[PDB]
DNA sequence: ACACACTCTCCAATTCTCTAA
């Protein structure tokens, strides 16, 4: 056979490295300032989001990141069970 | 066999030269044309090869036998502008009907030669063979019949009818009004000519205009000119105006709305509307120019292509990436930007609509087309005549027909009667609003109750059944009888009209549209929005109302309007106030603000406000960065109050049940 | 097919250029029988063929080169001329096969001594030098004047692409 | 209001109101323009007799 | 089969071509200087189109004064800096003059295929030398002087071309050719897949006479210690020939860049 | 034999459609 293909999936969010890393930085990473204009702050918040995209999954565009997350986002069990979880936890 | 083929383009080119010719004696230099015998008979046959033979074998090959021999060019045109230029100067004074029976029957072959070409997966793979070729000598006929003594055969087609014309409609025969549907018969395909559409077999992934035609003798400009010298729009005025007495209008009436779609169709009704003057626009459009090269410099380096350095960024975590060029050195956003454009994969793509010839359904039309001075007055005083004169007696008639006729309807016809519709209503409404001369009393037929059930019916059985092209008209259609209704309501029956409008069954109807607009061609969702920016303004003015606004608010229209939205490099300036106005009513009025935090929007934001796309003086800035500023004010204090958000961003919202109702608030 | 048409119905040019005219078969019969019949018939004032006593000679001399005057042509049957100038490499292919039936005429198996006659054409009414051609002159036929600077040996060339050959230089 | 009755446009209708040379040339001859054959076949004969 | 249309095929357009076409159509009209002895006006481009029409001429020649004076100044400035971009704009005005005063000129018996038309300008603000071309100037409207040192012979320069294929009974017309010889991609008949073997049908294409010819600068223009450049330009229609070995000149065109084809 | 241009082929990744809980 011929190499199979590399893709994302939602084993490598669930990981230690995935998305666990951006709820345990994210209060310390960005930072708003009426002091900045609009486009300003704009711009900032997709720098982390950026940086931690290309570090889990360098294959795609950006966009592409975002838009093949909504896939598995929707539809994988698992995660949306690690989701009402990140939700009960604030109900806790 | 090709012996047999040529034998019958042979025989074809002896009856091409038994019709006659001009006369050797003249010394006339050169004289026109003179006249053979068995022309009857040679007349009839060649209807016959087209009707017994190619019709019933389904072939285009006779055509091509006539085109190759060149017979409507060569003798049909003289033959005929003979006969009438010889009445007209019996006429000025003040067996020959043998001479009036050639006049019929050559103008007959003109209708067949130049009617236009439909193919399917049921012509024949004759036809599908020649169909790119026939193409390009219909285009010659065009250029041709508009040029001769500039145009006078037209005049010899009114002269047919003004014999029928004549006396009264108490004695007209079948046969006799056969005369006045095939006139206008004829002036329907002189319009609907136009350049080919390339077309091929899909076997492997990889201009038609022949060398004696160009596009100013083809343009629709040029019929305008040729027609208002030959005296046609005389024709159709009184035509169609005294049309309510008596001629019998089952014969007139629909080939009488084709002629009026087909040159509406590609005219955007602000060009009829003014709102040095050249040069001066010009000149301004130079500074937009200018603009851009400046956009084009500001990403410009000063020292040349080799010079450059090299350039490594570290992360957090003490990683490094590598990039290279003389800006990435000073700019981050530019070298952020550079570094994932290298990436080669894009996502493949998904893509509705065919059968019928170009028009605004399927192209875009911020396009214009255009005219001479004595062409755009000429033009503007025709269908203002007509619409002062006609439009209501012509509606009128149509629709009380189609409402009998509406189980055996066709796709065109039906496309034809929802963008005759709409084009009239609209432009009457702009004439208004712009001067006091005119009135709306003109176009007000539109909302009697007949014809509000019959767009009404047609946009129904079309969505049923998937058909999304006359669901695209007729969504146009509907639109408009609503622009209209506002319009008189800024002033009886109509309110009585707008209940019956806005029954529940409709509600469900118009609520649906937008959602299934994601997937579909720019255009459609661009007609979905504008048609919700309407019926939601109405309903607004009704005084319900809060059942039907929770009615809309749900994820797959936001996704439709993100969707639309991001390609506002191609879009107006009018419709990015539409869009943003739904997002204050959903933000702000609503309180649903759970919607919209999600993050294709925050990209969306950064790209349209940043110094690449939206310029910095135009109106939109003022609505957007107003719009921004308060999203981000909220989003703060959400964030901030549940810290669990920065993981919602990237995902839609979460439906179950217990934990939804505190996440979406 | 069997049909032919007058020379008056030649004085219109009725496809979209002269070559494709020309090449039909119906007009290149016409034009055929036209040829031969001007060739077997032109005077002098004195009566006495001038062809009739050209063909005559070429026998006697065993050659293969067959004469035309172009006034000659232009005298009657003018439209041919016009023709000739416009087309010669279709127009001398007809001449050529009319040329070779008139022969045979006054040389029966004349077909064993040469298989093949060339038609040369004289007194072309207008002159240029090298200065004066232009693209406009392309395919067209010319008459020109100069001295010969340089000259190659002769060589053979295959005639048709069993084999036959011609001279080249 | 206007009307563009009938009887108005039929009344209205009608009452409204150098190859240069050389070319030139052959087509003014070309429009201008057995026994025949006797001569041709005199000169043929001519080698029976002389 | 798998019949399909090109239903996507409609295509970007450029606004400011279309204005300057309809721009220049309008001072091609109404430039409407007076007289030379009375306040009269005179309209004397519409004079100049009726006198080529009288002689069946090819080229017309416009005034860059009379240019430089109308609305404002903008479509000379168009015109001049941006030329290679904006001439087939301004064919596009002038045919349609032409067919609307004269349109016995449209054409060069069978069919009469269109005349090529000219445009041309003089009267240019000022004269650069050999020495003064800088690729900043790239693709603007300049003139230049100097000597004939050399010329080449005329010869045919393809222009639009037409193919027929070998395989079917199918051909292929107004292919462009740029700097090279250049033929059709596809067999158009979707019944037959050759690519090879076309051939290029000479009575249906195009050519025009092309000129190649040689200069150098001015001998009294040399600066000091220096030597004189060179310069090799393109002359094309009615203008080959007119240039003489030995001659002083005073051209003016657009300067271009030739690739290594 | 060593880089190239071009052709051919198979396989699995993807999206679309139907069914039942
Ligand atoms: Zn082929």
């Known amino acids: 056979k011929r190499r199979p293909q590399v893709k994302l999936t939602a084993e490598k969010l669930l990981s230690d490295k995935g998305l666990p890393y951006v709820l345990k930085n994210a209060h310390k990473r960005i930072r708003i300032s009426s002091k900045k204009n609009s486009y300003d702050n704009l711009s900032n918040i997709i720098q982390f989001y950026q940086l931690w995209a290309h570090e889990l999954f360098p294959k795609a565009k950006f966009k592409d990141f975002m838009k093949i997350c909504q896939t598995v986002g929707k539809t994988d069990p698992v995660l949306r069970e690690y989701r009402v979880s990140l939700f009960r936890d604030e109900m806790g | ?616 003086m135009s109106r939109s800035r003022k609505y957007v960065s107003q719009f921004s500023d308060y999203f981000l004010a909220r989003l703060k204090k959400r964030l901030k109050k549940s810290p669990a958000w920065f993981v919602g961003l990237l995902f839609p919202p979460l439906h179950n049940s217990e934990v939804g109702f505190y996440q979406r608030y | 097919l069997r049909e032919e048409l007058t020379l008056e119905s030649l004085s219109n040019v009725k496809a979209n250029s002269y070559s494709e005219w020309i090449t039909q078969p119906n007009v290149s019969r016409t034009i055929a029988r036209e040829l031969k019949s001007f060739l077997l018939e032109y005077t002098d004032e004195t009566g006495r063929s001038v062809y009739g006593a050209r063909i005559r000679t070429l026998g006697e001399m065993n050659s293969e080169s067959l004469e035309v005057n172009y006034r000659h042509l232009a005298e009657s049957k003018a439209i041919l001329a016009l023709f000739l100038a416009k087309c010669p490499e279709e127009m001398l292919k007809i001449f050529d096969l009319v040329a070779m039936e008139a022969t045979e005429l006054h040389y029966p198996d004349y077909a064993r001594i040469h298989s093949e006659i060339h038609v040369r054409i004289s007194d072309f009414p207008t002159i240029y030098s090298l200065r004066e051609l232009r693209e406009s002159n392309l395919s067209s036929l010319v008459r020109v004047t100069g001295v010969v600077t340089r000259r190659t040996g002769v060589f053979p060339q295959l005639k048709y692409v069993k084999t036959v050959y011609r001279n080249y230089q | 209001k206007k009307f563009f009755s009938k009887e108005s446009f039929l009344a209205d209708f009608d009452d409204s109101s150098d190859h240069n040379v050389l070319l030139n040339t052959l087509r003014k001859a070309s429009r201008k323009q057995n026994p025949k054959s006797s001569a041709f076949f005199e000169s043929m004969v001519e080698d029976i007799i002389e | 089969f798998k019949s399909r249309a090109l239903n996507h095929v409609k295509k970007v357009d450029d606004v400011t071509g279309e204005k300057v076409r309809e721009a220049f159509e309008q001072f091609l009209e109404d430039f409407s200087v007076q007289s030379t002895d009375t306040g009269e006006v005179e309209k004397v481009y519409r004079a100049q189109i009726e006198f080529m029409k009288i002689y069946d001429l090819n080229t017309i020649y416009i005034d860059y004064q009379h240019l430089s004076m109308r609305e404002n100044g903008a479509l000379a400035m168009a015109i001049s800096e941006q030329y290679y971009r904006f001439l087939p704009f301004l064919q596009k005005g002038l045919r349609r003059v032409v067919r609307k005063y004269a349109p016995e000129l449209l054409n060069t018996s069978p069919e009469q295929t269109e005349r090529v038309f000219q445009i041309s300008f003089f009267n240019l603000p000022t004269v650069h030398r050999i020495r003064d071309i800088r690729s900043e100037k790239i693709g603007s409207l300049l003139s230049i002087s100097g000597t004939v040192t050399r010329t080449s012979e005329v010869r045919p320069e393809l222009y639009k071309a037409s193919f027929t294929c070998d395989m079917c009974r199918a051909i292929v017309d107004n292919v462009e050719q740029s700097f090279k010889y250049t033929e059709p991609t596809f067999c158009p008949n979707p019944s037959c897949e050759n690519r090879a073997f076309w051939t290029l049908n000479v009575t249906r294409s195009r050519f025009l006479d092309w000129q190649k010819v040689r200069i150098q600068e001015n001998a009294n223009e040399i600066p000091t210690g220096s030597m004189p450049r060179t310069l090799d330009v393109i002359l094309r229609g009615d203008s080959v020939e007119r240039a003489k070995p030995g001659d002083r000149c005073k051209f003016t065109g657009v300067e271009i860049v030739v690739p290594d084809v």
């Not at chain 2, 998937?466 to 509907?478: D, E, L, R, S, Y």
Request: proline share 3%.
């Open chain 2, 1 to 616: 066999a090709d012996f047999s083929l040529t034998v019958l383009r042979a025989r074809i080119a002896l009856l091409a030269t038994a019709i006659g010719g001009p006369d050797y004696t003249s010394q006339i230099d050169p004289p026109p044309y003179k006249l053979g015998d068995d022309c009857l008979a040679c007349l009839k046959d060649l209807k016959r090869w087209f009707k017994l033979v190619d019709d019933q074998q389904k072939r285009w090959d006779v055509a091509m036998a006539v085109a190759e021999y060149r017979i409507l060019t060569d003798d049909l045109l003289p033959i005929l502008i003979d006969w009438e230029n010889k009445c007209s100067l019996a006429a000025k004074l003040a067996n020959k009907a043998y001479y009036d029976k050639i006049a019929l029957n050559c103008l007959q072959l003109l209708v067949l030669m130049t009617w236009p070409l439909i193919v399917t997966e049921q012509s024949s793979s004759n036809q599908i063979t020649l169909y790119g070729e026939l193409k390009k000598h219909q285009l010659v006929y065009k250029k041709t019949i508009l040029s001769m003594e500039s145009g006078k055969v037209l005049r010899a087609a009114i002269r047919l009818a003004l014999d029928v014309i004549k006396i009264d409609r108490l004695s007209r025969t079948p046969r006799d009004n056969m005369v006045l549907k095939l006139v206008l018969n004829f002036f329907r395909n002189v319009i609907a000519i136009e350049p080919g559409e390339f077309t091929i077999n899909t076997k492997k992934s990889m201009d038609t205009l022949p060398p004696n035609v160009s596009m100013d003798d083809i343009s629709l400009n040029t019929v305008i000119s040729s027609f208002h010298k030959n005296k046609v729009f005389g024709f159709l005025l009184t035509l169609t105006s005294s049309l309510s007495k008596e001629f019998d209008q089952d014969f007139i009436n629909i080939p009488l709305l084709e002629i009026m779609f087909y040159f509406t169709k590609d005219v955007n009704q602000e060009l009829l509307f003014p709102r040095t003057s050249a040069g001066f626009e010009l000149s301004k459009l130079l500074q937009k120019e200018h603009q851009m090269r400046k956009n084009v410099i500001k990403h410009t380096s000063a020292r040349h292509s080799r010079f450059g350095g090299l350039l490594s960024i570290q992360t957090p975590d003490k990683t490094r990436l590598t990039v290279s060029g003389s800006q990435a050195l000073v700019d981050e956003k530019i070298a952020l930007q550079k570094l994932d454009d290298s990436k080669k994969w894009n996502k493949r793509i998904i893509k509705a609509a065919e059968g019928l010839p170009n028009s605004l359904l399927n192209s875009q039309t911020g396009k214009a087309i255009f005219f001479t001075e004595s062409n755009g007055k000429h033009f503007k005083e025709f269908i203002n005549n007509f619409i002062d004169s006609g439009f209501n007696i012509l509606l009128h008639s149509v629709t009380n027909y189609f409402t009998t006729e509406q189980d055996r309807m066709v796709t065109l016809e039906q496309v034809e009667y929802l963008l005759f519709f709409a084009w009239f209503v609209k432009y009457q409404l702009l004439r208004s609003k712009i001067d006091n001369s005119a009135d709306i009393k003109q176009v007000s037929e539109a909302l009697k109750e007949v014809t509000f059930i019959l767009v009404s019916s047609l946009l129904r059985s079309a969505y049923d059944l998937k058909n999304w092209t006359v669901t695209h008209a007729g969504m146009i259609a509907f639109n408009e009888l609503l622009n209209l209704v506002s319009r008189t309501k800024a002033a009886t029956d109509i309110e009585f009209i707008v209940s019956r409008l806005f029954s529940d069954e409709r509600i469900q109807l118009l609520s649906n549209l937008p959602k299934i607009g994601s997937k579909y061609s720019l255009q459609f969702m661009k007609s979905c929005i504008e048609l919700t920016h309407s019926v939601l303004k109405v309903l607004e003015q009704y005084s319900n109302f809060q059942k039907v606004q929770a009615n809309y608010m749900t994820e797959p229209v936001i996704e439709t309007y993100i969707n639309f939205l991001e390609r506002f490099r191609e879009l107006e300036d009018d419709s990015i106030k539409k869009v943003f106005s739904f997002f204050h009513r959903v933000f702000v009025q609503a309180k649903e603000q759970a919607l919209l935090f999600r993050f294709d929007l925050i990209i969306l934001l950064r790209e349209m406000l940043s110094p690449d796309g939206l310029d910095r």
